[PDB]
Design a protein around this ligand. Structure first.
Ligand SMILES: COc1cc2ncnc(Nc3ccc(F)c(Cl)c3)c2cc1OCCCN1CCOCC1
Length: 297
């Protein structure tokens, strides 16, 4: 559906601040100024470092993604560079969030984020789409109770060895089941409050380490059931890994008894927001439809 992707002229938006960069592109806070208007509307803009016809084809796919837990591509500007326009998420990315709130995040939040990320990935799988680059740095925070996967389509439009399934490292094979491996690493990032996976180990050594049977270590707050889920995501046989629909169920179950599955100091005073505070967040900055968060029994 072409109506889902707005083609913008470079003249109707401006980049005002660098937010971050990767090997692939640079993300800016930008301002959209509608033609004829004086209002300046904040947006996110990513500029990547015949081809346009292939780019637009993928952009239409990225603009078709409609789910509470995956960010949708809203617009594109094709000049000498490709620029992607998306909704700005003022809370930023989840990796930064867990780092900046280290040991000050309740179990109910951590487990619900795991659910939401699995729901987003399950939606992509239902659409027959593979993400290929799931990582905490590519999950954004809409509100503390609402996270969303971003950077979908990046690979197909344009290498993170330490997030990749072994078969992806060795054979650059990407499937829903290799997405599950990366989901496992992403969960590990959350549960360690943003530790770097395989810290101090060169990327060139990762395949041999995995082949030896070594994996990321159990995070201190994780009980055995949570760690076993992670380990299952990192099995060599792709078909032996959990499915996203299974992950949704498991983390949803744990979210109903959060203190049973994660051990966090001071957890009893870090509950989900009250209905009052939840309604306030939604009214201000989250008016979109979404499944209710899983509360504790
Ligand atoms: C408030 O911060 C962000 C909001 C965002 N809102 C929406 N989208 C973002 N990323 C993004 C990702 C892919 C895209 F195609 C586009 Cl257009 C945008 C965003 C990235 C954002 O920050 C990215 C950089 C985070 N760095 C990580 C390193 O330490 C400094 C902070």
């Amino acid at each position: 559906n072409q109506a889902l992707l707005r083609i913008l002229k470079e003249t109707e938006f401006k980049k005002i601040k660098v937010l971050g960069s990767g090997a692939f592109g640079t993300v800016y806070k930008g301002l959209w100024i509608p033609e004829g208007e004086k209002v300046k509307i904040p947006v996110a803009i990513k500029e990547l470092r015949k081809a346009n016809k292939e780019i637009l084809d993928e952009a239409y796919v990225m603009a078709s993604v409609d789910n509470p837990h995956v960010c949708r591509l809203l617009g594109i500007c094709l000049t000498s560079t490709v620029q992607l326009i998306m909704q700005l998420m003022p809370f930023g990315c989840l990796l930064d969030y867990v780092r900046e709130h280290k040991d000050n995040i309740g179990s109910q939040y951590l487990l619900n984020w795991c659910v939401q990320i699995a729901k987003g990935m399950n939606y992509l799988e239902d659409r027959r789409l593979v993400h290929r680059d799931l990582a905490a740095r590519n999950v954004l925070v809409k509100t503390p109770q609402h996270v969303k996967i971003t950077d979908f389509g990046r690979a197909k439009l344009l290498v993170p060895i330490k997030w990749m399934a072994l078969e992806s490292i060795l054979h650059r094979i990407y499937t829903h089941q290799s997405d599950v491996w990366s989901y496992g690493v992403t969960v590990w990032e959350l549960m360690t409050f943003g530790s770097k996976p395989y810290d101090g180990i060169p990327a060139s050594e990762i395949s041999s380490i995995l082949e030896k049977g070594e994996r990321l270590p159990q995070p201190p707050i994780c009980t055995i059931d949570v760690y076993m889920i992670m380990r299952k995501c990192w099995m060599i046989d792709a078909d032996s890994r959990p499915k996203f629909r299974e992950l949704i169920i498991e983390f949803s179950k744990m979210a109903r008894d959060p203190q049973r599955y994660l051990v966090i100091q001071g957890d009893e005073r870090m509950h989900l927001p009250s209905p009052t505070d939840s309604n306030f967040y939604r009214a201000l900055m989250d008016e979109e439809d979404m499944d209710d968060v899983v509360d504790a029994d």
